[PDB]
Design a protein around this motif. Structure first.
Motif, PDB file in Angstrom:
ATOM      1  N   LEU B  10       0.818  -1.210   0.000  1.00 19.73           N
ATOM      2  CA  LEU B  10       0.000   0.000   0.000  1.00 19.73           C
ATOM      3  C   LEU B  10       0.855   1.265   0.000  1.00 19.73           C
ATOM      4  N   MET B  11       1.970   1.232   0.724  1.00 20.40           N
ATOM      5  CA  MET B  11       2.882   2.372   0.761  1.00 20.40           C
ATOM      6  C   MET B  11       3.749   2.429  -0.493  1.00 20.40           C
ATOM      7  N   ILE B  12       4.030   1.264  -1.067  1.00 21.22           N
ATOM      8  CA  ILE B  12       4.852   1.176  -2.269  1.00 21.22           C
ATOM      9  C   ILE B  12       4.068   1.660  -3.492  1.00 21.22           C
ATOM     10  N   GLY B  13       2.756   1.451  -3.473  1.00 22.33           N
ATOM     11  CA  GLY B  13       1.900   1.923  -4.545  1.00 22.33           C
ATOM     12  C   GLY B  13       1.726   0.904  -5.653  1.00 22.33           C
ATOM     13  N   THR B  14       1.584  -0.358  -5.264  1.00 20.72           N
ATOM     14  CA  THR B  14       1.390  -1.443  -6.215  1.00 20.72           C
ATOM     15  C   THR B  14      -0.022  -1.421  -6.780  1.00 20.72           C
ATOM     16  N   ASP B  15      -0.141  -1.645  -8.085  1.00 20.47           N
ATOM     17  CA  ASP B  15      -1.442  -1.864  -8.698  1.00 20.47           C
ATOM     18  C   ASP B  15      -1.961  -3.230  -8.252  1.00 20.47           C
ATOM     19  N   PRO B  16      -3.078  -3.249  -7.510  1.00 18.05           N
ATOM     20  CA  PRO B  16      -3.610  -4.523  -7.013  1.00 18.05           C
ATOM     21  C   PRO B  16      -4.052  -5.426  -8.157  1.00 18.05           C
ATOM     22  N   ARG B  17      -4.314  -4.816  -9.307  1.00 16.34           N
ATOM     23  CA  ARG B  17      -4.747  -5.549 -10.487  1.00 16.34           C
ATOM     24  C   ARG B  17      -3.660  -6.510 -10.966  1.00 16.34           C
ATOM     25  N   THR B  18      -2.403  -6.090 -10.866  1.00 15.13           N
ATOM     26  CA  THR B  18      -1.295  -6.938 -11.285  1.00 15.13           C
ATOM     27  C   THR B  18      -1.025  -8.030 -10.253  1.00 15.13           C
ATOM     28  N   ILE B  19      -1.412  -7.782  -9.006  1.00 15.82           N
ATOM     29  CA  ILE B  19      -1.379  -8.825  -7.986  1.00 15.82           C
ATOM     30  C   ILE B  19      -2.418  -9.882  -8.338  1.00 15.82           C
ATOM     31  N   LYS B  21      -3.411 -10.599 -11.145  1.00 15.12           N
ATOM     32  CA  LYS B  21      -2.958 -11.316 -12.328  1.00 15.12           C
ATOM     33  C   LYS B  21      -2.430 -12.684 -11.899  1.00 15.12           C
ATOM     34  N   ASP B  22      -1.867 -12.731 -10.694  1.00 19.00           N
ATOM     35  CA  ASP B  22      -1.351 -13.968 -10.116  1.00 19.00           C
ATOM     36  C   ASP B  22      -2.406 -14.706  -9.303  1.00 19.00           C
ATOM     37  N   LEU B  23      -3.120 -13.973  -8.453  1.00 22.28           N
ATOM     38  CA  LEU B  23      -4.108 -14.577  -7.564  1.00 22.28           C
ATOM     39  C   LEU B  23      -5.317 -15.098  -8.331  1.00 22.28           C
ATOM     40  N   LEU B  24      -5.689 -14.387  -9.385  1.00 19.96           N
ATOM     41  CA  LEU B  24      -6.763 -14.834 -10.260  1.00 19.96           C
ATOM     42  C   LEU B  24      -6.286 -14.870 -11.699  1.00 19.96           C
ATOM     43  N   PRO B  25      -5.451 -15.862 -12.044  1.00 20.72           N
ATOM     44  CA  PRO B  25      -5.166 -16.018 -13.469  1.00 20.72           C
ATOM     45  C   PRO B  25      -6.436 -16.494 -14.160  1.00 20.72           C
ATOM     46  N   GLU B  26      -6.467 -16.454 -15.488  1.00 20.53           N
ATOM     47  CA  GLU B  26      -7.643 -16.817 -16.290  1.00 20.53           C
ATOM     48  C   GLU B  26      -8.956 -16.194 -15.779  1.00 20.53           C
ATOM     49  N   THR B  27      -8.845 -15.045 -15.120  1.00 19.02           N
ATOM     50  CA  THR B  27     -10.000 -14.207 -14.815  1.00 19.02           C
ATOM     51  C   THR B  27      -9.615 -12.736 -14.884  1.00 19.02           C
ATOM     52  N   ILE B  28     -10.248 -12.017 -15.802  1.00 20.90           N
ATOM     53  CA  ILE B  28     -10.055 -10.583 -15.918  1.00 20.90           C
ATOM     54  C   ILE B  28     -11.160  -9.858 -15.159  1.00 20.90           C
ATOM     55  N   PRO B  29     -10.799  -9.189 -14.055  1.00 17.58           N
ATOM     56  CA  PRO B  29     -11.803  -8.428 -13.305  1.00 17.58           C
ATOM     57  C   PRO B  29     -12.244  -7.191 -14.080  1.00 17.58           C
ATOM     58  N   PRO B  30     -13.541  -6.853 -14.006  1.00 21.39           N
ATOM     59  CA  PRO B  30     -14.113  -5.732 -14.759  1.00 21.39           C
ATOM     60  C   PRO B  30     -13.413  -4.414 -14.445  1.00 21.39           C
ATOM     61  N   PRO B  31     -13.294  -3.528 -15.447  1.00 20.78           N
ATOM     62  CA  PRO B  31     -12.565  -2.260 -15.321  1.00 20.78           C
ATOM     63  C   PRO B  31     -13.275  -1.193 -14.482  1.00 20.78           C
ATOM     64  N   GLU B  32     -14.522  -1.434 -14.090  1.00 20.97           N
ATOM     65  CA  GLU B  32     -15.258  -0.448 -13.301  1.00 20.97           C
ATOM     66  C   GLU B  32     -14.877  -0.508 -11.823  1.00 20.97           C
ATOM     67  N   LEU B  33     -14.192  -1.578 -11.432  1.00 21.17           N
ATOM     68  CA  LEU B  33     -13.790  -1.771 -10.041  1.00 21.17           C
ATOM     69  C   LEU B  33     -12.693  -0.795  -9.629  1.00 21.17           C
ATOM     70  N   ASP B  34     -12.941  -0.032  -8.567  1.00 21.37           N
ATOM     71  CA  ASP B  34     -11.929   0.878  -8.042  1.00 21.37           C
ATOM     72  C   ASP B  34     -10.907   0.092  -7.223  1.00 21.37           C
ATOM     73  N   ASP B  35      -9.740   0.691  -7.003  1.00 21.33           N
ATOM     74  CA  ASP B  35      -8.611  -0.009  -6.393  1.00 21.33           C
ATOM     75  C   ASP B  35      -8.840  -0.388  -4.933  1.00 21.33           C
ATOM     76  N   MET B  36      -9.712   0.346  -4.250  1.00 18.85           N
ATOM     77  CA  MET B  36     -10.066   0.007  -2.877  1.00 18.85           C
ATOM     78  C   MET B  36     -10.820  -1.322  -2.856  1.00 18.85           C
ATOM     79  N   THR B  37     -11.599  -1.567  -3.905  1.00 16.20           N
ATOM     80  CA  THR B  37     -12.361  -2.802  -4.038  1.00 16.20           C
ATOM     81  C   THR B  37     -11.456  -3.968  -4.436  1.00 16.20           C
TER      82      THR B  37
END
Ligand SMILES: C[C@H]1CN(C)c2ccc(-c3cccc(C(F)(F)F)c3)nc2N1C(=O)Nc1cccc(-c2cnco2)c1
Ligand SMILES: C[C@H]1CN(C)c2ccc(-c3cccc(C(F)(F)F)c3)nc2N1C(=O)Nc1cccc(-c2cnco2)c1
Ligand SMILES: CS(=O)(=O)NCCC1CCN(c2ncnc3cc(C(N)=O)sc23)CC1
Ligand SMILES: CS(=O)(=O)NCCC1CCN(c2ncnc3cc(C(N)=O)sc23)CC1
Ligand SMILES: [Zn+2]
Ligand SMILES: [Zn+2]
Lengths: 335, 335
Positions: B10-19, B21-37
């Motif tokens: 959170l302090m480093i400023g990682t895009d949770p979406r790229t996380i 990418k590993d935790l949910l491969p073969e699933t693309i989460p919808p682009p309307e989701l904000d980063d807090m979600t």
């Protein structure tokens, strides 16, 4: 997980000996011990199971406001954290006075000397320079202070044990207060112990002039008016023990706000009350040595603001976005 | 405690979406989701109890060398970590190629494009510049490689599943190897699939010239000799599945060395074997999503050196100070 704590301090380059100053007070470890050994001692202490285990039926922020609005007889422990937003950094932080020792207080040898009665008798010049920095009538109480003040108006506060000497609890109007390390409220002479109010001595201090006792012989040098803060060498206020004796068997809710709980006697309180009494944590950082039922992490004011909002009513009138970590941790703005 | 992991990022400023990418491969989460979600989704996944729970009768480094010297049929999983000391940084690290994308590979749009068959067919120029950086005959195998090689000589190695494409396992002389994402060992033509050895193509590549198939018509542009690394768009080697089918019911010890276990199919192996099979971790950092019986943390070579020293005999001849965190974590040099 004491791993995070240790690793964090290993890269930062902390002297484990100063950690042990907290973990083992009233014990000086021998100087022949190398730092690799001192660290394993630290780990050995933190890895010991805490006296008071966590209540498992209590976890969420919803549980927290429920306990808050239902409980009378509440004990709140406050440390340096509740005052950082007011303009007073933790002494132990990077903008605090201990780290500013070589900058603004080159006379002082130790951080300890600042509040050592033996040094103060030698030389009170550096204490009163510092006293002007944090003197009453320079800072306004935080949202946390006012929150505690409101709980006291409402009859919910059994006691607020504070570690702070800034006397902001006084300003906030908190009644049922216990200042464990004393406060700037009064000042007594070392010799004749003639007592006086702070707003009086204000002028003397604000003009870099040392207050002396108007009743002592002027020949006497130790005739000095010292704010009744508990210095090293001096005993704790006996009212702490008198208060804690009663409180421990009448407390039904314990809230820790803005304290590391590194320093006795307050550090001992969470493990000196009945284990079935719910304990909630509000702090920027979690604590390695103690287990709390609910842990709210981030800026103390930000968190109190949320609870005040949730509690509604009177508490909402104080108000001027989190992540949940199951089963009982919340991350607000702050870390 | 997934708190450390989240707060750190959170302090480093990682895009949770790229996380994700590993935790949910073969699933693309919808682009309307904000980063807090997206962060709460991350937490929700990590906080889920792991399939395979930790064996409680197995904890110490003493337990580890006991299992090591007693067990035959051992499975070792290795990632980018075992090669950093050889001179090859993790692609995902700060001196790695993904972070060097804008510096040395401005042609590439994604880090993905480096190993995307669709981009490679468009433009293989950037892949072969990179190939010259990590080409066989430029790095010597680490102490970990040699260690694994020795276990294979000794008949203890059921299999080494590696994620690396650097072919250092080849150089180290490791026999029972499975290269999950392929390797530079061979190179086939895209068209006629004519196969060839790496030491041959070396010259073409070391002189920035693209290797083409000597048998195809020169008119053909897609007549290119591609090192049989598994690119995006291509299937996994079918031997992985054939190997894993047998191994899972014959493995009695699993060692993870120098891998984050972020990436399938290797990431799945710890939870695809019998839960009574002891699992040991050797890594610079602990893993949030998986539980190991013994966790050895620090420089992989430094740790292997200790075990080799402890195992004595043949293993000691490989040799070129820790802290214990009960019940099963050790901190060596590295973090
Ligand atoms: C690493 C082990 C064995 N080693 C590494 C030690 C070597 C020396 C000491 C030691 C010797 C003299 C004095 C002290 C002192 F306690 F620090 F003062 C410690 N302590 C320990 N160790 C301790 O665990 N010491 C220790 C000292 C004080 C408290 C505790 C303890 C651990 N869990 C609850 O209390 C543990
Ligand atoms: C925060 C909660 C409720 N909120 C915050 C959500 C709002 C939206 C989504 C969501 C919606 C569409 C797609 C996805 C996607 F899975 F990421 F693709 C997630 N997921 C969640 N949440 C999830 O927990 N999502 C989620 C998504 C995928 C897997 C898991 C999960 C949690 N534990 C095991 O798997 C949980
Ligand atoms: C430790 S003692 O018994 O001998 N008494 C000596 C003086 C203590 C006073 C309280 N202490 C603090 N320490 C660190 N930060 C802060 C911030 C404060 C505030 N805003 O009032 S008080 C404080 C410790 C020393
Ligand atoms: C993910 S895939 O199936 O489509 N195949 C594409 C290419 C993969 C190759 C393996 N990967 C790595 N990733 C990060 N660091 C490293 C360090 C390596 C080494 N020393 O050999 S390999 C490696 C990932 C990509
Ligand atoms: Zn006097
Ligand atoms: Zn061809």
């Amino acid at each position: 997980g004491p791993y995070t704590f240790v690793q964090q301090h290993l890269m930062i380059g902390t002297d484990p000996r100063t950690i042990l100053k907290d973990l083992l007070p009233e014990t000086i470890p021998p100087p022949e011990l190398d730092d690799m050994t001192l660290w394993q001692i630290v780990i050995n202490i933190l890895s010991e199971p805490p006296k008071r285990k966590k209540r498992k039926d209590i976890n969420t922020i919803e549980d927290a406001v429920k306990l808050l609005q239902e409980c009378k007889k509440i004990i709140v422990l406050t440390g340096a954290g509740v005052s950082v937003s007011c303009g007073i950094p933790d002494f132990r932080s990077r903008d605090g006075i201990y780290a500013r020792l070589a900058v603004d207080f080159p006379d002082l040898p130790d951080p300890q000397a600042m509040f050592d009665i033996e040094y103060f008798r030698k030389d009170p010049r550096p204490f009163f320079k510092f006293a002007k920095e944090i003197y009453p009538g320079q800072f306004q109480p935080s949202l946390c202070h006012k929150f505690i003040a409101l709980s006291d108006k409402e009859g919910k506060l059994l006691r607020n044990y504070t570690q702070n000497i800034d006397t902001l609890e006084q300003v906030a109007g908190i009644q049922r207060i216990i200042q464990c390390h004393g406060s700037f409220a009064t000042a007594s002479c070392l010799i004749c112990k003639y007592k006086v109010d702070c707003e009086a001595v204000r002028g003397d201090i604000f003009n870099q002039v040392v207050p002396r006792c108007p009743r002592c012989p002027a020949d006497e040098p130790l005739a000095i008016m010292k704010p009744e803060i508990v210095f090293f060498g001096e005993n704790l206020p006996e009212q702490f023990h008198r208060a804690m004796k009663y409180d421990k068997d009448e407390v039904d809710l314990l809230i820790v706000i803005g304290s590391s709980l590194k320093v006795r006697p307050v550090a001992l309180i969470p493990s000196s009350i009945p284990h079935e009494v719910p304990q909630i944590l509000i702090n920027r950082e979690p604590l390695p040595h103690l287990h709390f039922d609910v842990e709210l992490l981030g800026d103390c004011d930000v968190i109190i603001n949320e609870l005040c909002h949730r509690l509604g009513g009177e508490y909402a009138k104080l108000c001027c976005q989190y992540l949940f970590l199951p089963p009982n941790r919340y991350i607000f703005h702050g870390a």
